Amino acid sequence: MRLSYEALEWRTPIENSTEPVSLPPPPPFFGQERAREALELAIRGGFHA
Amino acid sequence: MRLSYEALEWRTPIENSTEPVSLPPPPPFFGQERAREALELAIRGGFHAYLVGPPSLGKHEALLAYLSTQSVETPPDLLYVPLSERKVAVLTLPSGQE
Amino acid sequence: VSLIRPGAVHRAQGGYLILDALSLKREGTWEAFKRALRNGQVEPVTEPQAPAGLEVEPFPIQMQVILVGTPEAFEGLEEDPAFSELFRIRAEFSPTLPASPENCTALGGWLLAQGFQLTQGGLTRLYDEARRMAEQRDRMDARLVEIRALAEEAAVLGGGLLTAESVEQAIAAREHRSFLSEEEFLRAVQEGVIRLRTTGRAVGEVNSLVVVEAAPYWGRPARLTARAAPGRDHLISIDREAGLGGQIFHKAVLTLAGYLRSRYIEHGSLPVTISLAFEQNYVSIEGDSAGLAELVAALSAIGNLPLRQDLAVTGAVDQTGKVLAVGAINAKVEGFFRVCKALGLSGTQGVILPEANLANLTLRAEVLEAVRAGQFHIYAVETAEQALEILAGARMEGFRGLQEKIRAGLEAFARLEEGHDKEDRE
Amino acid sequence: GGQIFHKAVLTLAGYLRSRYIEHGSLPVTISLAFEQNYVSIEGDSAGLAELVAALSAIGNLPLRQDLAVTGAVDQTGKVLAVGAINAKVEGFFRVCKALGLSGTQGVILPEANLANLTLRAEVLEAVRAGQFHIYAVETAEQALEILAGARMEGFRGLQEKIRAGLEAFARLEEGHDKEDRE
Amino acid sequence: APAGLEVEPFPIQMQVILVGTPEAFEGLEEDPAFSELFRIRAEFSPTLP
Numbered sequence A: 001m002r003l004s005y006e007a008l009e010w011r012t013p014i015e016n017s018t019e020p021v022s023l024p025p026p027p028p029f030f031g032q033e034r035a036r037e038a039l040e041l042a043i044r045g046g047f048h049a
Numbered sequence B: 001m002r003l004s005y006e007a008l009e010w011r012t013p014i015e016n017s018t019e020p021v022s023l024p025p026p027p028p029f030f031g032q033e034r035a036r037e038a039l040e041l042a043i044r045g046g047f048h049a050y051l052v053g054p055p056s057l058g059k060h061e062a063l064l065a066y067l068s069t070q071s072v073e074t075p076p077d078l079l080y081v082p083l084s085e086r087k088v089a090v091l092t093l094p095s096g097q098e
Numbered sequence C: 001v002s003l004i005r006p007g008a009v010h011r012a013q014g015g016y017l018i019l020d021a022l023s024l025k026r027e028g029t030w031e032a033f034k035r036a037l038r039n040g041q042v043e044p045v046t047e048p049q050a051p052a053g054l055e056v057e058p059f060p061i062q063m064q065v066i067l068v069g070t071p072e073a074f075e076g077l078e079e080d081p082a083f084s085e086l087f088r089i090r091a092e093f094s095p096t097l098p099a100s101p102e103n104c105t106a107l108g109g110w111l112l113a114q115g116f117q118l119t120q121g122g123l124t125r126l127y128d129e130a131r132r133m134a135e136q137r138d139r140m141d142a143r144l145v146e147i148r149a150l151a152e153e154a155a156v157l158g159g160g161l162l163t164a165e166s167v168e169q170a171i172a173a174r175e176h177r178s179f180l181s182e183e184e185f186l187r188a189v190q191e192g193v194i195r196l197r198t199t200g201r202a203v204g205e206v207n208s209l210v211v212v213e214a215a216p217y218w219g220r221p222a223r224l225t226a227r228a229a230p231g232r233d234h235l236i237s238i239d240r241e242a243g244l245g246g247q248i249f250h251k252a253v254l255t256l257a258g259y260l261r262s263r264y265i266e267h268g269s270l271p272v273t274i275s276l277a278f279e280q281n282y283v284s285i286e287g288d289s290a291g292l293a294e295l296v297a298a299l300s301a302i303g304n305l306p307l308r309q310d311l312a313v314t315g316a317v318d319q320t321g322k323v324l325a326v327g328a329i330n331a332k333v334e335g336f337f338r339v340c341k342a343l344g345l346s347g348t349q350g351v352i353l354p355e356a357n358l359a360n361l362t363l364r365a366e367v368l369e370a371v372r373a374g375q376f377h378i379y380a381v382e383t384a385e386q387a388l389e390i391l392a393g394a395r396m397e398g399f400r401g402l403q404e405k406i407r408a409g410l411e412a413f414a415r416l417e418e419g420h421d422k423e424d425r426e
Numbered sequence D: 001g002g003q004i005f006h007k008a009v010l011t012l013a014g015y016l017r018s019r020y021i022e023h024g025s026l027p028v029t030i031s032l033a034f035e036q037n038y039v040s041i042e043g044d045s046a047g048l049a050e051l052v053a054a055l056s057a058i059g060n061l062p063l064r065q066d067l068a069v070t071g072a073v074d075q076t077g078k079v080l081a082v083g084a085i086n087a088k089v090e091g092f093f094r095v096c097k098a099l100g101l102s103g104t105q106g107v108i109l110p111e112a113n114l115a116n117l118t119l120r121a122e123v124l125e126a127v128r129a130g131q132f133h134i135y136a137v138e139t140a141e142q143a144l145e146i147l148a149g150a151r152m153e154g155f156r157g158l159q160e161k162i163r164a165g166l167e168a169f170a171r172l173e174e175g176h177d178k179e180d181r182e
Numbered sequence E: 001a002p003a004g005l006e007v008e009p010f011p012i013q014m015q016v017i018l019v020g021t022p023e024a025f026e027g028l029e030e031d032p033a034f035s036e037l038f039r040i041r042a043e044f045s046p047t048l049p
């Protein structure tokens, strides 16, 4: 059945295209918590990863 | 037919997760009596043996430990003697005589 | 004479020289080594630029060399008769030790010798994991360095003490570190990208169990569809016709085709053609572990039998209709349970596996707990008759039987080809 | 055609064999060709397109050429997800715009790819304006119903016409046999 | 080289962390010594939520 535009509109709406954002730097491997945990285990245990 | 949990429970029951175990070190090639016997035969007969096993099984460490357990007559001190300015040969002498 | 440096052979005199088969057949020094052994020809090597070289007189060899290597490392070196004549003693390490309390005690003593600190529960969990590695309930894996690596992981996860909880944590962390592929597969199944049915009854669809390659093998269900159409006997393996199915896969297809040919005889040749395809396969198929699933799917397609989609079917089958043992049954069962849990356990999902694999069923804690709670089942069969009885939820023998329905379906297909021939002649 | 392309062809062939049973073996032979292809084909993205084209050829069903058809199909007649759906939809919209948007051109894509539809601004604006459509289906039955502009089930339906076409083909083959025997 | 210093084997205190694509490692995973030396697998998800 035909998809409506709203059902197809995927872009996140923009509040404003101005006012430069000021955000804190994210932690390393942000969104990659699996790799972060594995590498933490490697550092703690002295293994080779 | 459907397998019951007891028919599927394979884990050995735990008496206690504490009281650190104190067990004597096992003999080298424990559970590998075939390889142990083969290597004993090789050591006794002075043959050349070859250790075959799936990778990462501890063959090197177990074999080294077992050979350290072994003993032999003191090896003669081998050395190179120049038979000439051109010719050299390996000369074996009793220990200390070198 | 003062500028010759002793090699391994020179300091091995009177003792033993340990060498690796890889380091010989790879570095090309095997021929020189065996000439130094047979003929006592130990020659201190020199660079080709050398203006002269000492004439080293052949030396009788007093050492006892002991090669170490994998079976594959020596089958590439056993082809030389000089090897078979020089190395007479073959020391084979069994891949699996028997699962005995003496073996567990020996493993614990070995771990304590390394410098570890085992609790009784930690040793028990490590021994159970070793049994699981061997995929046998009565054999424990002999790879001691694998168990040592797991012990090191559990020690750093437990502060230095190998507690049962610490070993379980190490196992879970090792599983999760290689879980990205299975996590993505689960997400794809949830999103509907890979359409799987862990509930309901569908005709001719069976959730075959497939084990992927790469770092630790994860099982995962693969939907299997069989469609029955009238026509001269041709059981088509779409994955093999396309060239994805391997040799053993084709052998399984032919085996079950022969079983179907010889099982239903009250017509001429099998009056149906069956198309078997792994949906969303896109990858080469190797092995014979979906023979039972293929057979039950084909039988359902022939007889129009709705098969319970909640049960995954694994296991090879011979051409007399008997389920045969398969490998990595733990991976298959755990993968299907993972997919069922991701879709939400219905309280009736299960796995149909060969009766011959009961000694190989070392399931994880969560799967066993689900089985105990009744949220997950494990059926064991030895003949495909039982597997199709379980899936279709009926009995072959008896009136309104599965066998009667399959016979009626074959009869209908034959009568349709017959009507086509009637129209051809008239 | 590559291995996966052949797998798709065989899959839809089996679906066609098992779907129409009121004769013996499928009484028709269907020729499927990518026109102006000249290049090796790899992948299973046109299984739905191949299936609907074959069904139209069997039933003499005129298919709306304004709609592009993508999506794999399994041999039970259900549309399967495909990759790079954004590229396919945007490419068809590009070609339609180059020829001039007719206000009815669209793309038929698997229902399972809705989570993958991240279209560009222009395609979304065209959809909002109604100048371009995006149909989502999960079974090939719906895709054929959309393309042929009729309803599968029902009197004078697509299924009835496909059955009539198969009956005519079998009729002609058995008429050839009637001549051969007499 | 007319001669060479005989360097005695040295214990390794470093922790090596290999980096590469899955294809760059599947051609290196076939060596059992790799799987025994590198126990920790840090996988980066291709897509974040």
Ligand SMILES: *[B]([O])([O])[C]([C][C]([C])[C])[N]C(=O)[C]([C]C1=[C][C]=[C][C]=[C]1)[N]C(=O)C1=[C]N=[C][C]=N1
Binding pocket: C208, C209, C210, C211, C212, C213, C249, C283, C284, C285, C286, C287, C288, C289, C290, C291, C326, C327, C328
């Ligand atoms: B099996 O376990 O026999 C199965 C049979 C197939 C017809 C469903 N194949 C596999 O699991 C194989 C690996 C294997 C492990 C142990 C013994 C034999 C084979 N893998 C695959 O078929 C596969 C398919 N797609 C992706 C990855 N792996």
Ligand SMILES: *[B]([O])([O])[C]([C][C]([C])[C])[N]C(=O)[C]([C]C1=[C][C]=[C][C]=[C]1)[N]C(=O)C1=[C]N=[C][C]=N1
Binding pocket: D005, D039, D040, D041, D042, D043, D044, D045, D046, D082, D083, D084
């Ligand atoms: B598809 O998306 O499965 C499709 C199948 C084909 C029958 C239309 N394959 C392709 O478009 C492939 C690329 C591809 C992308 C993603 C997954 C699989 C395949 N390319 C081609 O077939 C092709 C043909 N001619 C020229 C260029 N590319």
